[PDB]
Amino acid sequence: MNRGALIKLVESRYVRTDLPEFRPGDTVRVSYKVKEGNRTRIQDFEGIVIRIRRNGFNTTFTVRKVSYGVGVERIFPLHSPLIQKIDIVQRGRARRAKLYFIRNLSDREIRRKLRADRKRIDQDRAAERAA
Amino acid sequence: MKGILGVKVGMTRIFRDDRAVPVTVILAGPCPVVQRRTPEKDGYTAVQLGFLPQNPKRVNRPLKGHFAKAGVEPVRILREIRDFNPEGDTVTVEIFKPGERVDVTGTSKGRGFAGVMKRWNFAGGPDSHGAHKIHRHPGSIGNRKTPGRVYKGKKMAGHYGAERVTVMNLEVVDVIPEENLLLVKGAVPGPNGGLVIVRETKKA
Amino acid sequence: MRHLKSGRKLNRHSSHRLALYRNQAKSLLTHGRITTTVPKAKELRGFVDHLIHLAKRGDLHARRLVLRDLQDVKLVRKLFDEIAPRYRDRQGGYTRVLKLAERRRGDGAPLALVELVE
Amino acid sequence: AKHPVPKKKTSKARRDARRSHHALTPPTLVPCPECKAMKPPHTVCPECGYYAGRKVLEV
Amino acid sequence: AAAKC
Amino acid sequence: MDEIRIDVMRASGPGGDGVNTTDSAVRVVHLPTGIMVTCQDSRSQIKNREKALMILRSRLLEMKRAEEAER
Amino acid sequence: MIQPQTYLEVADNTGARKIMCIRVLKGSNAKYATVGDVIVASVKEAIPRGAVKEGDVVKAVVVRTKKEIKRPDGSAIRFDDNAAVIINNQLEPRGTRVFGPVARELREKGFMKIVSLAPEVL
RNA sequence: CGAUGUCGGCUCGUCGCAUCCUGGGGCUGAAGAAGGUCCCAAGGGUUGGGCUGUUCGCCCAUUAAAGCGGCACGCGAGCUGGGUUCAGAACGUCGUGAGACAGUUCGGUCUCUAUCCGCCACGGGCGCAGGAGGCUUGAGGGGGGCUCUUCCUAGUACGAGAGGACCGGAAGGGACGCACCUCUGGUUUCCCAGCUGUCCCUCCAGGGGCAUAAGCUGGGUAGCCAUGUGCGGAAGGGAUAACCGCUGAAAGCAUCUAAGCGGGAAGCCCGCCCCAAGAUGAGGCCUCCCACGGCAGCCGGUAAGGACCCGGGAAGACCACCCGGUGGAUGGGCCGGGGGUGUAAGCGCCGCGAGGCGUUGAGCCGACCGGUCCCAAUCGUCCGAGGUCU
RNA sequence: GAAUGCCGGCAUGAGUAACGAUAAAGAGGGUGAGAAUCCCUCUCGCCGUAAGCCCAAGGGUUCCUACGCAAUGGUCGUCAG
Numbered sequence A: 001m002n003r004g005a006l007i008k009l010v011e012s013r014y015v016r017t018d019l020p021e022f023r024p025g026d027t028v029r030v031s032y033k034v035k036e037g038n039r040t041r042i043q044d045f046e047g048i049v050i051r052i053r054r055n056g057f058n059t060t061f062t063v064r065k066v067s068y069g070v071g072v073e074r075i076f077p078l079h080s081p082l083i084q085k086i087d088i089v090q091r092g093r094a095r096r097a098k099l100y101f102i103r104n105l106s107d108r109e110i111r112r113k114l115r116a117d118r119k120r121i122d123q124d125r126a127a128e129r130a131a
Numbered sequence B: 001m002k003g004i005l006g007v008k009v010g011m012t013r014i015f016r017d018d019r020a021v022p023v024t025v026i027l028a029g030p031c032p033v034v035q036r037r038t039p040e041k042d043g044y045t046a047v048q049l050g051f052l053p054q055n056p057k058r059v060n061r062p063l064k065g066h067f068a069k070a071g072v073e074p075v076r077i078l079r080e081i082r083d084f085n086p087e088g089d090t091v092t093v094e095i096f097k098p099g100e101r102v103d104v105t106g107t108s109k110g111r112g113f114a115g116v117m118k119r120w121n122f123a124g125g126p127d128s129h130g131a132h133k134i135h136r137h138p139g140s141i142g143n144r145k146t147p148g149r150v151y152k153g154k155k156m157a158g159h160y161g162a163e164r165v166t167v168m169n170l171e172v173v174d175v176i177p178e179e180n181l182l183l184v185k186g187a188v189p190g191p192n193g194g195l196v197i198v199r200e201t202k203k204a
Numbered sequence C: 001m002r003h004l005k006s007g008r009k010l011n012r013h014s015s016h017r018l019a020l021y022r023n024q025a026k027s028l029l030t031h032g033r034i035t036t037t038v039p040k041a042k043e044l045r046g047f048v049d050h051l052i053h054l055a056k057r058g059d060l061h062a063r064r065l066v067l068r069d070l071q072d073v074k075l076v077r078k079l080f081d082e083i084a085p086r087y088r089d090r091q092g093g094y095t096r097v098l099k100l101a102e103r104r105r106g107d108g109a110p111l112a113l114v115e116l117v118e
Numbered sequence D: 001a002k003h004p005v006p007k008k009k010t011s012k013a014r015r016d017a018r019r020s021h022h023a024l025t026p027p028t029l030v031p032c033p034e035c036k037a038m039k040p041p042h043t044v045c046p047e048c049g050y051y052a053g054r055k056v057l058e059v
Numbered sequence E: 001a002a003a004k005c
Numbered sequence F: 001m002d003e004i005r006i007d008v009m010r011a012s013g014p015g016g017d018g019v020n021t022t023d024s025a026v027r028v029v030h031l032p033t034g035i036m037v038t039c040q041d042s043r044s045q046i047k048n049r050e051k052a053l054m055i056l057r058s059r060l061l062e063m064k065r066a067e068e069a070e071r
Numbered sequence G: 001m002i003q004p005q006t007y008l009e010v011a012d013n014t015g016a017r018k019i020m021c022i023r024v025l026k027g028s029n030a031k032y033a034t035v036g037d038v039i040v041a042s043v044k045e046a047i048p049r050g051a052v053k054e055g056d057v058v059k060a061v062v063v064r065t066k067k068e069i070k071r072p073d074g075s076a077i078r079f080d081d082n083a084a085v086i087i088n089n090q091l092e093p094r095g096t097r098v099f100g101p102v103a104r105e106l107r108e109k110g111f112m113k114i115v116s117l118a119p120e121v122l
Numbered sequence H: 001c002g003a004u005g006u007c008g009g010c011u012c013g014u015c016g017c018a019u020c021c022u023g024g025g026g027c028u029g030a031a032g033a034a035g036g037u038c039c040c041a042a043g044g045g046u047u048g049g050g051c052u053g054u055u056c057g058c059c060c061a062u063u064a065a066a067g068c069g070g071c072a073c074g075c076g077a078g079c080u081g082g083g084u085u086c087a088g089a090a091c092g093u094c095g096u097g098a099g100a101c102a103g104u105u106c107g108g109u110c111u112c113u114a115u116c117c118g119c120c121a122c123g124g125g126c127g128c129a130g131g132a133g134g135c136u137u138g139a140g141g142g143g144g145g146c147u148c149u150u151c152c153u154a155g156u157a158c159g160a161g162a163g164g165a166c167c168g169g170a171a172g173g174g175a176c177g178c179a180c181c182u183c184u185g186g187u188u189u190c191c192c193a194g195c196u197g198u199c200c201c202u203c204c205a206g207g208g209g210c211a212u213a214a215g216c217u218g219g220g221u222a223g224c225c226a227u228g229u230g231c232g233g234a235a236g237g238g239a240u241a242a243c244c245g246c247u248g249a250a251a252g253c254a255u256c257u258a259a260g261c262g263g264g265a266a267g268c269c270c271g272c273c274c275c276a277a278g279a280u281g282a283g284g285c286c287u288c289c290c291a292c293g294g295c296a297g298c299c300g301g302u303a304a305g306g307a308c309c310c311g312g313g314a315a316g317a318c319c320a321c322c323c324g325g326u327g328g329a330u331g332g333g334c335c336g337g338g339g340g341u342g343u344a345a346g347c348g349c350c351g352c353g354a355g356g357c358g359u360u361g362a363g364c365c366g367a368c369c370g371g372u373c374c375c376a377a378u379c380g381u382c383c384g385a386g387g388u389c390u
Numbered sequence I: 001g002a003a004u005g006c007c008g009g010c011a012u013g014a015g016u017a018a019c020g021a022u023a024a025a026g027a028g029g030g031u032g033a034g035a036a037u038c039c040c041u042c043u044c045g046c047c048g049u050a051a052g053c054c055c056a057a058g059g060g061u062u063c064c065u066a067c068g069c070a071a072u073g074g075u076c077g078u079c080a081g
């Protein structure tokens, strides 16, 4: 038997492909299905991806945003069915895979360290030219 | 009572009604009936299941005879499921349906010689304030001249794990019969690749 | 516990263990066959096979990679020009450990030969 | 600690009962198929230098 | 060594 | 005495193995008012219990005399 | 994960600025408080002339934690501070404004006035 | 008195019951709710802080409750040493003085090696009348045993109101236990990268050592883990305690009792989980070998089998256990995937330059999931029945 | 037959603690009856206000060369104060 294969076979019915690739440093908008008392509504959470810990189906990414003077971080399963969509808001470029250090940086400092990833910005604009 | 032999494949989680559900996958079947214990012949009721086919070049003549009386290919494991008389000649994952509760029996992970802190969750000792070479020690093990001895069953360092453990009342989250797979919610004793036993729960 | 842990420790701290593997690599690659203790011989196969596989690649990058462990340009030159050609069609398994019959007298240690294969 | 110490001399009987586990097992030896000498299995013959049916070292 | 006083 | 609790315990200070092991100290508590008197003046719980009750009574009395005098 | 000695910011306008948890009001001996649990606390730091003053022993519900909160859907949420809203023994907030985001767990635990007052629920 | 180490704390508990809680009750000056009092009951539970060396006690905030005692006031060959309990010093006090103090004050050496019993783990031997490979019965042990809130019933019964049930039915907790690593969060001694100083290779470039037993720093797989996850306390059957009865004499009445029967506890037996046939009372079942040769014994060579040796293992201190040993995927290599790091070197281009851009998510790359006989588990050896009597 | 007697011998603890700084080793070649431990070469590591060098005190042949390995050397020894 191939145990890893079996596990992947169990997870295959739950894997998503509809979501855009992003990298730590990218500013992203996760549209998330939330229940509140009775109904379910879609709440937006937009922030800088500070982390993607990969484990195949079990990959999760962590998005950080300052919200009314308070920094909030929110961890999402990358293949959650609660995730309506993820919009790339902006392409930042980092020099490492985890950006925990931006938790102790000022606004202008984060602006300086994670700059516009011109290359992957142009790749984005060159795509969608698939008319 | 209904049972089946299995292999612990690994863990992961699925989503069910917008809930992430931790699961342990088990490769249960298929388990051919090799022997049936009956009140007349053996004094009790049980079914000896086989599991995992074996290299016939690795099965001695006593065991080959045991399989020949059954008409079964040589197999790696024989385990009885007590008080279980399956209808046919083969026991498969289909004996369980999603939503049933099961007890799973595995062989725990072996800690080897285990400290009193790991084995019994003792508090150990202080790490400063004068503590003298007793940070992970058990402390006193008794009284004085009365009784002048240590009780049997006293909690002490020693081997820990690699032991039969039965976790009970696990939700069967899914059955995938084409792959002989079983999904139980929660944790199951032992390593991946370890052999397990899945019986119908005794809770109610 | 040691569950699923790869790698002997050989009663050496981290920098001494790495230097041990490098020195045995320099000697194996130098003489083609060395005698050492059975546990050392077994751990060397992996360290040396990897170096010979990079030699089989032959690019400047592999040579620079191999030099980090071997340091000797003349030895690396022998690794690339004389040794790696012998293994061009061999899929790993460039080293062989056979065990000797007589234990070392001063400490009883079991010995083995390690050699490059034909 | 407070210096533990043997309470009684161990008797000849008790001392020698502790040693009932100390006898050496003789070395496992097989004949070399090349030169018929007794050597431990899975080692190169130290007498003729053969292993796996061929010469591996000089002796 | 502490004392029985 | 039914509204008086008497506590006995180890005293403080010198005494060696004596002070370590003897319930010579006494606390007497007037349960209605809550006021307490303590005594470890001697080595004897009995003498200390007596002196404690003496002082306790003398203090309650001075309270009762003070109320009637304010009245 | 709040416990006795833990300092919490006050996310309301009661006058209190820092409160120190002295008790987790969750049973006989709960070790930890998280979002939506009530605590008893000492008011360690306050602005002048507020409703509560330094020294007051108050109740509050924890609204934000630096230890992330796990949710049945597999997600989690984490805040930059540990914050609480000071309440009365009837669970109603004692201030009139709630500063900063609060955890959606407060809703499902019957702190609806607080959830209402909060500028964002996460 | 040729030494029985003395307070408190810590650790580890175990027992008693005169019971703090929880369960069951009778009486009540018991309307309800909440109490009081006594009876049964020791299964489980019995919080975190401030003060003080404290025990004790007070206080804060909670709790179902914050029980009381025994065990050399349990436990210093288990720890501590704040106190007590030597030698220094000082205050008060006493003494002419030297000195003295259940008076105070600051300080003041707590001993690596366990022989026997006991305890926790693990083997070796023999036994269990043939010799073997499996699978098991469970005598008898052990584990476990807590409890709260809210809601519905129902704002009903009860009560002037305030308040506010029984019974039954839901949901959610705290602490504890067992297991687990998918997620969360740790570690991850060399898996990747960045950085300084110095010395070296080989001058540039690119690298190596050392700065810890990782030089430092940012990260980090598997594993091992809790702060994370799953699950447990039962349900149910039986016999009881206090207590309440049915029928019922003695004793025309009465009586729970003398004959008989019922109900009745978190407790008792079983039930659940784990160990267990050295259970010498050594059990049961399925299967395999078989009357060998030589003077209830001996000795050889064998059978079924097993061991030795070897490659290993989420098994493990050794031992054991488990798997594999070329008819082989057991380890190592190699290969693919995962995963980590985060875009190698070299070259080209821009800049005076530090650098930047491109090639490029590149290069490197532990353990994870697989594949592949490239390397190594070569070749073998030794044990091992012939079955007592009735 | 006892004096924690005296002198000596031999047991037990026990194949147990330990083998004296955690600066660190690996291989190849030589010698020899015998080599982890001696010699040689290469690689590695450690000290470098020292763990290098020179005096004085003290020690008194421990210096050099050959030949040796019973004991001394905490193992071994072909080596050595």
Ligand SMILES: [Mg+2]
Residues within 6 Å of the ligand: A004, A007, B010
């Ligand atoms: Mg997996």
Ligand SMILES: [Mg+2]
Residues within 6 Å of the ligand: A066, A107, A110
């Ligand atoms: Mg910002």
Ligand SMILES: [Mg+2]
Residues within 6 Å of the ligand: A112, A113, A115
């Ligand atoms: Mg920049």
Ligand SMILES: [Mg+2]
Residues within 6 Å of the ligand: A117, A118, A119, A120
């Ligand atoms: Mg770019």
Ligand SMILES: [Mg+2]
Residues within 6 Å of the ligand: B076
């Ligand atoms: Mg198997």
Ligand SMILES: [Mg+2]
Residues within 6 Å of the ligand: B008, B105, B106, B107, B108, B189, B190, B191, B194, B195, B196
């Ligand atoms: Mg298992």
Ligand SMILES: [Mg+2]
Residues within 6 Å of the ligand: B109
């Ligand atoms: Mg585990």
Ligand SMILES: [Mg+2]
Residues within 6 Å of the ligand: B115, B116, B117, B118, B124, B136, B137, B138
């Ligand atoms: Mg311990």
Ligand SMILES: [Mg+2]
Residues within 6 Å of the ligand: B117, B118, B121
């Ligand atoms: Mg623990």
Ligand SMILES: [Mg+2]
Residues within 6 Å of the ligand: B118, B119, B120, B121
């Ligand atoms: Mg444990």
Ligand SMILES: [Mg+2]
Residues within 6 Å of the ligand: B123, B124, B125, B126
């Ligand atoms: Mg502790």
Ligand SMILES: [Mg+2]
Residues within 6 Å of the ligand: none
């Ligand atoms: Mg503690």
Ligand SMILES: [Mg+2]
Residues within 6 Å of the ligand: B123, B124, B125, B126
């Ligand atoms: Mg601790």
Ligand SMILES: [Mg+2]
Residues within 6 Å of the ligand: B127, B128, B135
């Ligand atoms: Mg420490």
Ligand SMILES: [Mg+2]
Residues within 6 Å of the ligand: B130, B132
């Ligand atoms: Mg000390």
Ligand SMILES: [Mg+2]
Residues within 6 Å of the ligand: B132, B133, B134, D001
């Ligand atoms: Mg100690």
